Structure formats: C-alpha cells, structure tokens
C-alpha cells in the first residue's frame, strides 16, 4: 500500500543503517549532507516507481487497445499484449510523437531504477574503497586525543597535589596527500552529473504532449497480414503515463533542489570551518597549532569528518564546555579542567 | 485489514521508536508534545490512505464508465482505464466542476502522502541536525548533576563522621546562544504552515459538490475520433470520492485541533516553568542561582528538555522527594539527604 | 515490486555477508574487487530476471496466439498453452527465424539463472576449499605481527627505563608453494570464460530480428489433424521478448565492462605493490627483509590479502602512522613508537 | 520468483547449516565433498521442481483438452480436470506412448521430491547415528593434542630456564573397529545407487517422443457414456512436459558428473593421505609413530575427519608452520617451538 511504501522509504532507516560490523562502532563514515543527498536521490525514484503502480492509483493493465466488439476477450488480450511488445517494433505501430515516447512510457520504471542504481554506485564505491582507511585513521586520531587529554589531566592533578605531537604530525602529513579528497570530489561530481542527466530525462519526459501514450497498433504481420476480419489498426493507450509524468516532474523538482547541495558539497574547503581542534589548543600536553584550512587536500575532508563525528568523544565535549565557559572568562581553563575530572 | 492498519499506526510504536543507538540511551531528544504532534500529523493521513482503499470499504475499481451493452468486457475496461488516464487530458473529458476536482480525486492518496512527508521532514531535520548537540550537552549536564550530588553527600557524610559551578556556567553560556531555539522555532513554524496548507486543501476538497466525481469521458481521439459504433461520450464516476471527502474532513478536524498545540509549542518561554534546577539549590556544593527564565534563547529549550527527561536521574529524584518533604518542614534538608544515602 | 527487487539485490548485502562463523572474525577472505565482480556477475542476471516479469512491466501471459472469434476462452487458452509447450516441438510450429530463437525466448530466465549459478560456482569453490587455509595462515601472521610489535615496544620501554623471524620464514616458505595462487587463477579464469560465453549468448540473443518472437503454431496433431473447424495455423507472439533483449544487452554491457576487471585480477603479481610489510622493517625485533614481489606464487596472493585486511591490526596502523610522520623526518621512529604506547 | 528460488537453494546456506547445538561447536561432522554431494543431489531436484512451475515459465494450467466451441467454460474445465484425474484410469484415455508416460508427466515433481528425500536419508542417518560418536571422539582427540602440545612447550620452557601416549593408543584401538567406516561406506553406496536409479529414470523420461504429453481423453463413463452431444474424445496436452524433460536432462547431467565423486568418496583409504599427525611427531612429549594408512577401518575415516577439521586447532597450526619453516632448515624445531609461545 501507499502508506507501507512511505514507511519503508521515508519513515524507516532506508540506507540510513550504520555499518553492521564492529570495525566502525559509532563512526558515521559519511557526512550527514552526503547521506541525505544519497538517501533522497536513491529512495525518491524507488518511491515513485512503487507509487505509480500502487493498487489504488492503478486502474489495472498498463495498456488497452479497444478491440472490436466481435473480438473475444482473449483476442483483445492478444491485441493488447502484442501492442505492448510492439512498442519496440517500429513497423507495427505508427504514432505521431514517434516511438521513443512509447519506449519511455513502457520502461519508465526501469529508467528510474537505473538512475537510482547509478546514484547509489558512487556512495558504495566510497564506502567500500575510501571508508575503511578514513575510519582507521579517525579512530586512531580520536584515541590519540583521548590519551593526550588523559595525560594532561593527570599532569594537572599531579601538579595540584615523550610529549611528542604525534597526532599533529599525522594531520600535517595528511595535509600533503590528496587521494581521499580526490575520490570524494570524483564521486560527488559523478553523482551531480547523474542527477543532471536524470533532470534532463525527466524534463523531456514531462514535456511530452500527453497524447503520445495513445499510439496506433497493427497486428498485421505473419498470417494475419492479409486477413480481412481483423481491422487494419487499433487504438491503444498506455495507462499510467500521466502518473509517470507527474512523478517525473516531482523527481525533477527534487533533483534540481538537491543539485545545489551537491555543488556546495563539492567545495569542501569552504565547508572546512569552525575548527574542531581549536578547542584542544588550551591543553598543556597539546601543541598550540591548528594548521588545517585553505587546501584541496585530505586534511580538509578529515576536518569535516572530525566536526561530524567528534561529539562522541568525552574529552572533546569537556574541552568544548570549557571553551564555552571561557566566553565569560570568570574562571581559569586549567582550574576548570582539573575540577571536571572527566578522564573516562 | 482495517484492524491491522489500526494496530500498525495507532496501537503500535509508529514513529515512537527511541533512537536505535548507544549514543542516546534513555534520552527522548524530542518533547512529548512535539512527538505527539508529529505522530498524529504523519500517521493520520497514512491511516486514512490505508482506510480509503481497505478491502472492505472498497467496492472494487476506482472508476466505472458504464459502457454500452454492446461493448465487450475489455472494451469497457479500455473505456474505464482511458478515462482514468484522461482525467489529466482536459480535452477528453468535460465536467461541470472542471478538471482540478478530477485531478484531486485521482491523486488524493498522493496528496496525503505528500503532506505526511512534508510534516515528517522538520522532525527529521531536527533529529539529524540539532539532536546530537543537545543530547551531548544534556548528557554532560546530567553527569555533572550526579557528580555534584555525590560530592555533596560525601561532604555531608564526612562532616557527620575546585568547588566550581561548571554546570551553572555552562547553562549561563547557553543563555546567550540561540541557534538551537531558532532551529526549533523554525521547524515548528514550518510544521504549522504545512498543517494550515493541508487544512486549506482538505476544506476545499470536502467543499466539492460531491458530484464532481461524475465526469463525461470521450474516447474520440485518434482513429476512433470519427468512428460511429462508439458513443460520443460515456458516464464515468470516480468511486471512493465520498470516502476521500469523509476522511479529508476527519483530517481537517484533527489538524485544526492540533494547530493550537503547535502554536502553544512555539511559545517556548511560557512553557519554561516549574524550575527543574530549583530543587538542586539546597545542595551546599551547588550555587544558589537558577537564572533560567524569560528568554528567546536556547536556555529555555534546555530547561524544557531537562524537565522532560530528568526523571531518569536518581539524584534529581532524591532532591525532589526532599523538596516535597520540606513542604511540611518537619525535618531538615541536610539530615534527610544524609539519611537517604542515594549516591548510586 | 521493482523497488523491492532493487533493495534486495543492489541496496542490500546480497552476497556481501561476511562468513557467519567465529572462525573468520573480521577476515574478508575475498578481495574487494573479486567480491564486487562476483556480486555483479551473479545479482545482475537475477535482477534482470526479476525485472522482466515484474507486475508492472508484464502485460500478462507470456504468449498469445489470437484464436478465432468463434473459439471460446478455454479453446484459445488451449491454443496458447499448446504453442507454449510446442516451441520445443519443431513440427508443430514453422517460424522464419527457426526454433532456436523460440527456445531462447522461452528459457531466457533459465539461461540467466544458469549463468549466475556458473559464475557463483568458482567463488563458492574458493570459499569452501582455499579460504580456510588462507584464513588460518593470515590469522597466524597477524598474531605474530602483533606479538613482535608488543615485544619490540616492551624492549624499547625497558631500554628507556629467541628473537627468531618466524613470520618471515613462513612467508619465505609460502614463496615456494603455489597451490593457492593456482586455484585463485583457475577460478578467475573460469569466471572470465563464463562471462565471455554469457556475452556471446547475450549478443546473439540481442541480434535477433525482434520478429522471431512471432511464430506460426499448428494444433493439428492427433484427432485434430484432420478437423475442419480449427484453422490450419495461428499467429502466436512471445510477449516480453523485447524486454528480454533490452535486459540482455544491458547484461552484455555490464559483463564486457567487467571482463577487463577480471583480466586485471588474473595478473596478481602486478597487483602486488605498496609493500604492506615495508612498514614493519623499522622494528628492531623484526628483520629488515621484505622479499615479496615478482612471483607467480602464493606469496603475492598473501601480500594482496594482507594489504586488504591488515587495517584491522592496531600494530600495523601504529607503524603506518609512524611511517607517515617519518615523511617529514622531524622526530625519530623509536621515540615515536615509545611515545605511542599502543601495545593493545 | 526464479531469483528467489536461486537465492534459497544455491546462494543460501541450504543444508549447509552447522549443527544448531553446543555439543558440536565448530565441528563439521561431514566431509566437504560429502556435504557438497548431498547439497547438490538434494537441492538440485527441488530447484528444478520450483523452476518448472515458476510464474514466468508457466503459461497456466498443466493440461488443456480443447473442448468444442459449444462447450461452456466449466464444461471445458470439467473435461480438463477429468482427463487430469484419468491419466491414471487407463480405459478413459488412449495414447500411443501408453499410460506410463502420462503418469510420469503428471507426477514428475513427486518423483524428483522422492529422489531428493531418498538422497537426504543416508546423510540424515549418518548425522543422527554415527555423527555424535565421531564428534565426541574427535573432540577428545583435539583436547589431547592441545594438552600434549601445552605439556611439551612447558617442558621446553622449563629446560630453557605419566608421559603416556593415550591419544596414540586410542587411534591404534580405532584401527581395529570398523563400524563407523562400514556405516559411511553403506550410506555412500546407497546414495550412489539412488543417484544411478535417478539417472536411469531421467534418461527414460527425456527419451520420450515429446508427443506422449498429447493423449486422447474420453469422458464417456457413467450417464455420459451414451450421450450424443458430447464428442467421443478430446485432444488433451500436458503442458510443461518439455520443461520437465529439459530439467530432467539437466539433473541427469549433474548426477552423472556427481557419481564419479561418490565413487571416489567410497575409496576412503586412497583419500587418506597427507598425514595430519606427522607434524606432531617432532614433539618430545609425543611418540614418533603415525601408524595410520592402508586400512578399510575407522582409522582412515578419522584421519579424513582430522585433516578436514584440524585447522581450528592452534597447536596443530603452530606445528604446521614449524614444519613449513623446517623445509629450509635454517633454524631448529625446539627453538622455534619455544620462541612461538603459543600455549593458548
Ligand atoms: C536512460 C534513458 C535513455 C533515454 C534516451 C535514449 C536515447 C535514444 C536515441 C535513439 C533514438 C532512435 O533510435 O530513434 C527512435 C527509436 O528509438 C529507439 O527505438 C531506442 C529507444 C531508446 C531506449 C529506451 C529504453 C530505455 C531502457 C532503460 C533500461 C534500464 C534498466 C537498467 C536496470 C525513433 O523514434 P523518435 O521519436 O526518436 O523518431 C521518430 C521520428 N523521427
Ligand atoms: C498539493 C495540492 C495541490 C492542489 C492545488 C494545485 C494548484 C492548481 C492550480 C492550477 C489549476 C489549473 O491549471 O487549472 C485547472 C487544471 O489544473 C490542472 O490540470 C492542474 C492540477 C493540479 C495538480 C494536482 C495533482 C496533485 C498531485 C500531487 C502529487 C504528490 C506526490 C508526492 C509524492 C483547470 O480546471 P479548473 O477546475 O481549475 O478550471 C476549469 C474551468 N475554469
Ligand atoms: C545455455 C545457452 C544455450 C544456447 C545454445 C544451445 C546450442 C544449440 C545447438 C543446437 C541447435 C539445433 O539443434 O538446431 C535448432 C533446434 O535447437 C533445439 O531444439 C535445441 C535448443 C537448445 C537448447 C536451448 C534451451 C536452453 C535451456 C537452458 C536451461 C538451463 C537451466 C539451468 C538451471 C534448429 O533450429 P535453428 O534455428 O538452429 O535452425 C532451423 C533452421 N536450420
Ligand atoms: C519412482 C519412479 C517410478 C517409475 C517406474 C514405475 C514402474 C512402472 C511399472 C508398471 C507399469 C505398468 O503397470 O504398465 C503401464 C501402467 O503403469 C501404471 O499405471 C503404473 C505407473 C507407475 C507409477 C508412476 C507414478 C510415480 C509416483 C511417485 C510418487 C512419489 C511421491 C513420494 C513423496 C501400462 O502402460 P505402458 O506404457 O507401460 O504400457 C502400455 C502398452 N503396453
Ligand atoms: C540520461 C541521458 C543519457 C539522457 C539524454 C537525453 C534524452 C532523455 C533525450 C532528450 C532529448 C532527446 C533527443 C531530442 C531530439 C532528437 C532528434 C530525433 O530525430 C532523434 C532523437 C533525438 C536525438 C532525441 C534523443 C533522446 C534525447 C537526447
Ligand atoms: C537540470 C535542469 C537544467 C533541467 C531542466 C529541464 C530542461 C533541461 C528541459 C525542460 C524542457 C526540455 C525541452 C522540452 C522539449 C524539447 C523539444 C525536443 O524536440 C528536443 C528537446 C527539448 C528542447 C527539451 C530539452 C530539455 C528541456 C529544456
Ligand atoms: C497545499 C496548498 C498549495 C494548497 C493551496 C490551495 C488549493 C488546494 C486550492 C484552494 C482554492 C483553489 C483555487 C480556487 C479558485 C481558482 C480559480 C480558477 O479559475 C483557477 C483555479 C483556482 C486559482 C484554484 C486553484 C487551487 C486552489 C488554490
Ligand atoms: C485552518 C482553517 C482556517 C481551515 C478552514 C477551512 C477553510 C479555509 C475552507 C472551508 C471552505 C473553503 C471554501 C469552499 C469553497 C470555495 C469556493 C471556491 O471557488 C474558492 C475556494 C473556497 C472559497 C474555499 C476556500 C477555503 C475554505 C474557506
Ligand atoms: C554459453 C555458450 C555455450 C553459448 C554458445 C553460443 C550460442 C549462444 C549460439 C551463438 C551462435 C549460434 C550458432 C549460429 C549458427 C548456427 C548454424 C545453424 O545451422 C545451426 C545452429 C548454429 C550452429 C548456432 C548454434 C548456437 C550458437 C553457437
Ligand atoms: C565478449 C564480446 C566480444 C562479445 C561481443 C558480442 C559478439 C560476440 C556478438 C554480437 C553480434 C553477434 C553476431 C550476430 C549475428 C550472427 C549471425 C548468425 O548467423 C551467427 C552468429 C552471429 C555471427 C553473431 C555472433 C556473435 C556476435 C558477433
Ligand atoms: C527408480 C527406478 C525404480 C526406476 C526404474 C526404471 C524406470 C524409470 C523405467 C525404465 C525402463 C522402464 C521399462 C521399459 C519397458 C517396459 C515394458 C512394458 O511392456 C512394461 C513397462 C516396462 C517394464 C518399463 C517399466 C518402467 C521402467 C523400468
Ligand atoms: C547412469 C547412466 C549410465 C545413465 C544413462 C542413461 C541411460 C541409462 C538411458 C538413456 C536412454 C535410455 C533408453 C531410452 C529408450 C529405451 C526404450 C524403452 O523401450 C526401454 C528403455 C530404453 C532402452 C532406455 C533405457 C535407459 C537409457 C539407456
Ligand atoms: C497475404 O496475401 C497477399 C495477397 O496479396 C500476399 O501477397 C501475401 O504473401 C500473403 N501473406 C501471407 C503471410 O501468406
Ligand atoms: C475522421 O473522419 C473525418 C471526416 O470528417 C476526417 O476529417 C478526419 O481526419 C478523420 N480522422 C482520422 C483520424 O482519420
Ligand atoms: C484424419 O483423416 C485423414 C483423411 O485423409 C486420415 O488420413 C487420417 O488418418 C485421420 N487422422 C486421424 C488421427 O484419425
Ligand atoms: C447408454 O445407452 C446404451 C444404449 O445401447 C445402453 O446400453 C447403456 O446401458 C446406457 N448407459 C447408461 C449409463 O444408462
């Protein structure tokens, strides 16, 4: 039913499932905006496919040819099925709009499924190629941040009663390499191109005259070519073409609204803001150097992933509340850190 | 069946599922009133869609055109399907009420699903954008309250046998920022606007003459335009239009009753009452300062979320019972706190 | 529905399920490229089979013979079923394209299923014959790497405050044996041959005239051979043949794009690059000798499997970050290793 | 659907499920070749049964008798059902090929299911009679091997810083008894005989003229015997007989390819090679005596089961890597064993 399709595709965790494995425990591995874009671009065409053939919106068979009254039920069924299979056969049918509109009307669900698959492909390539590496690197970075926070609080407590910046060096090294950012931009660009092509196709499909679904059909090949009792042609109409056009314009609207989001996603350096690591600069055990901005490198992408999935880090949360309290400046950062006692 | 739909949509945890993740363990992340509003506004139109096409209420096909007796079954089926697809084609049909009523009668389930999706969108935006931040902040606040309660009871026990207000400073800082409250008000306002538009549409749909479902249909395009055996027109009726109007007025009543709730929700400062933190003011380790009221800021929203999901805090429950006992004044707050022995 | 099939076969973990057993905990046991190739080559033909007979794309029965009007419904049904069963019987039918096109049109789903099974066979043979051995060997290798890393860090810590290369000897011994690599190459080659044969078949099927689906059928055997009221022949058409050809060309395109991937897979020594063990050469407890390259031996395959599933090793990750930091050369490898404190 | 059947029967763990009980944790209890043979021989005929009546390959009803035009739909249905039930009644029908072909055409699914059940019976008898005993014995043997390995490594460590061969005596005793091997050979031989009988039946079924499915049917018993309006006979055809023959030849090919595998399985002593226990002979605590070869006794079968499910033993894996390293001979077996430190 329509409501069942809605529950499956919008109100359920459709493509929102976290990786089912212990390797990525709590790691999104995909930005929220990218996940939203993929979920829409994939589950919208599927939802429209399901809707267009819902038991309520669908009168019945997808084509009716209006055989003569003399024709029996199965003769008329032969006519309808023959014309359905003959939309491909150009000789059989003669339609003013041509045969491409008939092909599109017959295979619209296939085309929507193709667009959905093509849009799901780049996210899958990301999740299967560049996701494990970033997951491992980000897990190491979070562990290092937790360890340095613990060491700093222990030092502060000892004072009240190595020291090498490994994480900073690793981030600096990531500043050079750009394979991950190149893959990310390539997959986003392919998604954008697929969306644009889908928009072109949907606009063309919705621009039809709405009468191209009606085509003339001739079961006059073979032994029936010279038969007399059979009329030279029939009036066939492809039902649900109006529904297809409505859903196609809906998908076109959604995709044109979505494309600016993908373009904004492509410009990762601009998105790289609100320095996540700036909060850690007040730790004595952490060097006061952010050095993450203004670069078409994997460093900006790692900064984005950190700003996305750093809320799960207790040390980061503690430092964030310390920073927020520092806005008033009533107290002292080391005193607040010592009082917090948030090692684990 | 009707009962199955009821069990799925009203008697089950439809959209009442808690976040399936360890990050939010026991945190609602959504006020009870907001959750009720979203659940109604989403699962009502879906329930009505399912009901309108239930196997019992539905006689059968959604349109019947009453072809002549001479017409065969599949000729009549062609007529019915053609008219179903031609509700869009204005030239084919001539109805007194126009063609918009026919469009609405055909696509009412789609319109209800659209309203449900549009009403579910703002809650989803909230849960995916502003929910993680408030979850982390509120978890930190609850942990700080538990820790300060433990410290105060330990101090009392030591007396019988830092001290910095970090949580108060954090709340004071939240008094300034307003991004969360702005997002909350924006999503509530969008929900209200969607509800009002849905009410307008449902009132228009229910105000129809009830005879607009009957339209005249002409299969007279193409080779059949000059055919003689076919009548110039047919009498088609869109079945289930009365059911659609009944369910639409039901949804209109529900939404007009719900809109005052959304308006009341918009005025969060008025809702900010029954100070949750007032109970903690009797703790020696906690400063006697509430400072949370009369502000279009995130502080009021945090106060609401606390008053919502603070019952899970054992220290808060203990302080609440101490406060309630203090109404009589027979005993002493520190003595009762020491006797409680409710560290964990 | 079409969307359900898509969810099952592309958006779900179809053939992507990890081995359901404690023996292989986190071990892929199959390279990512090989898994992708198998998943495509298997779940594409199945998806096309499901699509070709979807409730929306399918008009109805797969063959209609257009019995005379005098014929009753069940007489026409007998004609259709007889011709469906007589596509095999060459005498009954006379078609210009022959009888092989009719066989193919009738049994296309069977042929796609056969290709899917034949393509799934070599992966299954691998997973049931050569997977347990490589799993055990690789688990031992990872355990040895973890143990040597722990010993090296313990030695470094002791200095700050046996020694036999068992793993290196085992890898060197693997350099000689080649049964695993021979099995891998044989299964890949069989997969490639099956893909090529499938491409040949699909090209032949798509090269048909598109009118071979229309064949002449004669129910004139037995008592009906000399019957007069029955016409000497009927015009039968195999519906969905156009859909079969469309999906067959789609599968042909996918398989021709996939075959280069399989050919590249066959050349494992070229794939053996980015020495995984090179990072471990900086450990005092590990001998400085890689000795893994330029060989049609199981050593290259083991190197590939290591480069695939070594990210799960904490010691390997730590050594990798040490290597990446060494690019700048600011610090010292032993000092960084001591500071890391990543025993477990 | 066809793809669903494929997923259930070839791509899923059909009859590949490990024993669902804690008694056999990780013990196959069935050789890989035997499991493959059983899985094929059982799930192939079931798959063919499901395929032959798939919603796509099946035109409709399994028999059509071509009643006269004067006959009504339910008169024709009576004719078809009567002939379907009268394939057994020899007097009613007169077919050139006889009545056995009609029996076979009607009950082919039953015959395939019978063959599948008969082939599944011997494996079930094994798993319910001789599997628990071998499971217990093999678990004891693995535990003894682990214990002796632990004792030997402990002795080596003590030197660096009872002694009775219970397992060897148990294996020697198993050398005498042969009940398990006799049961194994009997079940394999019964499986082979069932496969041969199935091949005979399938060859006979596929050797039919392909026109035996067409039989003459006479509804002329009872009050209708002397009725005039009813024709003396009808032309009935059993649909799907061609599909049955195709699938039967497929099953015949599979079974003839499989029978050599079963014959090779029967010769267990030849399969008994690559002495698993030879690796343990280098342990000081283990006597240097294999004494397992060249015997129609349970010892060879136990050797096969060990070679199958010994990879799960850490001590065996360690000894195997020690053996492989000994190929070069660079080091010493006791030194390598001491350095390994693989007690558990
Ligand atoms: C994806 C979207 C593809 C849509 C665009 C396809 C480009 C078609 C260009 C060729 C057109 C062509 O040959 O001319 C028409 C025939 O088209 C044809 O006969 C070819 C029809 C094109 C194929 C449409 C079917 C798409 C199936 C998608 C399946 C995906 C499934 C994946 C799981 C003639 O007619 P006319 O009107 O152009 O001219 C008639 C008067 N001059
Ligand atoms: C959402 C609710 C939308 C309802 C309001 C739509 C505004 C329509 C304004 C245009 C009306 C128009 O062009 O005039 C009518 C034709 O309408 C048309 O032909 C356009 C019909 C409007 C589209 C209705 C279909 C809604 C489909 C929703 C799908 C959502 C799915 C999302 C998953 C003519 O006839 P008349 O009677 O006005 O005048 C006849 C005598 N002057
Ligand atoms: C797998 C793909 C197999 C396709 C290629 C099969 C090779 C056929 C070669 C023999 C052809 C033959 O005997 O000649 C035709 C009859 O074919 C026949 O009567 C034999 C038809 C071949 C069998 C096709 C059915 C495949 C079923 C697959 C089932 C798999 C299920 C597994 C679970 C005559 O006609 P003509 O047109 O060639 O000449 C007519 C004018 N000279
Ligand atoms: C298992 C495979 C069994 C197939 C071989 C059965 C042996 C039949 C030997 C007796 C044949 C017989 O009595 O002669 C035919 C009648 O057969 C009959 O009337 C007996 C038909 C044999 C039974 C076939 C039905 C198998 C049902 C399997 C059900 C399994 C379900 C288990 C869950 C006469 O005709 P003609 O052509 O031989 O001679 C006609 C001109 N002389
Ligand atoms: C997804 C991508 C590939 C879709 C590409 C656009 C498709 C949907 C449409 C939009 C405009 C279309 C073209 C418009 C006009 C003509 C001229 C005609 O004489 C032949 C077909 C041809 C050349 C059409 C082919 C298909 C076409 C290119
Ligand atoms: C992503 C955005 C830009 C998509 C907007 C849809 C655009 C591309 C659509 C809307 C209307 C469409 C046009 C409608 C009609 C025709 C006439 C036909 O003979 C050739 C294609 C052509 C000229 C179409 C080309 C594509 C088109 C311009
Ligand atoms: C969800 C929102 C967009 C719904 C908006 C209201 C819809 C349901 C209805 C209510 C009143 C309607 C209008 C009433 C009268 C007319 C005048 C007529 O000559 C053209 C249509 C037009 C202009 C209608 C368009 C659709 C309309 C605006
Ligand atoms: C949220 C609350 C206010 C909704 C209450 C429903 C109201 C808005 C409904 C109920 C009856 C409706 C009217 C019924 C009939 C017509 C005549 C038509 O030619 C134009 C629209 C118009 C004038 C409708 C406008 C909307 C309407 C006034
Ligand atoms: C999967 C593998 C086995 C498929 C092999 C190719 C199949 C699909 C096709 C492609 C070309 C075909 C051949 C083309 C021409 C002829 C000549 C004709 O007089 C008899 C059939 C015969 C000999 C065909 C047999 C089937 C054939 C070989
Ligand atoms: C893997 C790649 C190479 C596959 C590409 C498809 C090729 C092999 C296909 C496409 C068109 C096909 C041809 C189409 C028509 C005929 C005529 C027929 O009488 C014999 C087979 C023959 C000659 C086919 C042989 C195979 C063929 C050449
Ligand atoms: C599974 C086992 C039992 C199958 C045994 C073979 C079956 C399928 C077939 C193969 C050959 C067949 C026989 C061939 C010829 C005749 C002679 C005829 O006048 C009576 C039936 C009889 C005697 C057939 C009986 C059934 C038969 C034995
Ligand atoms: C396991 C292997 C050997 C099976 C190979 C199938 C063999 C046994 C099949 C293939 C063709 C079959 C023959 C086909 C036709 C007839 C004629 C009939 O009047 C008696 C049975 C008889 C003589 C069949 C006996 C069995 C048969 C020889
Ligand atoms: C049909 O009859 C015409 C008469 O002109 C003839 O040309 C044609 O070949 C016939 N077709 C068939 C299929 O017999
Ligand atoms: C139908 O016949 C009329 C007669 O006036 C003619 O004008 C019209 O073009 C014909 N239509 C078709 C589709 O042939
Ligand atoms: C049909 O009648 C013809 C007349 O020539 C005869 O040859 C043939 O044998 C008959 N067929 C049957 C099945 O009785
Ligand atoms: C049918 O009529 C015949 C006439 O010869 C007679 O012999 C036979 O008994 C009748 N059968 C029945 C069932 O009445």
From Swiss-Prot, chains A, B, C, D:
Keywords: Calcium, Calcium channel, Calcium transport, Cell membrane, Differentiation, Disease variant, Disulfide bond, Endoplasmic reticulum, Glycoprotein, Ion channel, Ion transport, Membrane, Oogenesis, Phosphoprotein, S-nitrosylation, Transmembrane, Transmembrane helix, Transport. Widely expressed. Highest expression is observed in oocytes and brain. Detected at very low levels in sperm cells. Its main location: membrane. It is a multi-pass membrane protein. It holds the Pfam family Innexin. Changing residue 309 to Q: Impaired glycosylation; loss of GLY2 form; oocyte death. Glycans are attached at residue 226. One of its GO terms (biological process) is positive regulation of interleukin-1 alpha production. PROSITE patterns: PANNEXIN. The keyword Ribosomal protein does not apply. S-nitrosylation inhibits channel currents and ATP release. N-glycosylation plays a role in cell surface targeting. Glycosylation at its extracellular surface makes unlikely that two oligomers could dock to form an intercellular channel such as in gap junctions. Exists in three glycosylation states: non-glycosylated (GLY0), high-mannose glycosylated (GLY1), and fully mature glycosylated (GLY2). Disulfide bonds join 65-236, 83-217. Changing residue 74 to E: Loss of voltage-dependence and anion selectivity. Strong increase in permeability of sodium over chloride. Residues 1-39, 127-188, 259-344 are cytoplasmic. The keyword Ligase does not apply. The modification S-nitrosocysteine is found at residues 39, 318. Belongs to the pannexin family. Ion channel involved in a variety of physiological functions such as blood pressure regulation, apoptotic cell clearance and oogenesis. Forms anion-selective channels with relatively low conductance and an order of permeabilities: nitrate>iodide>chlroride>>aspartate=glutamate=gluconate. Can release ATP upon activation through phosphorylation or cleavage at C-terminus. May play a role as a Ca(2+)-leak channel to regulate ER Ca(2+) homeostasis. Homoheptameric. This is Pannexin-1. It comes from Homo sapiens (Human). The lineage of its organism: Eukaryota, Metazoa, Chordata, Craniata, Vertebrata. The gene is PANX1.
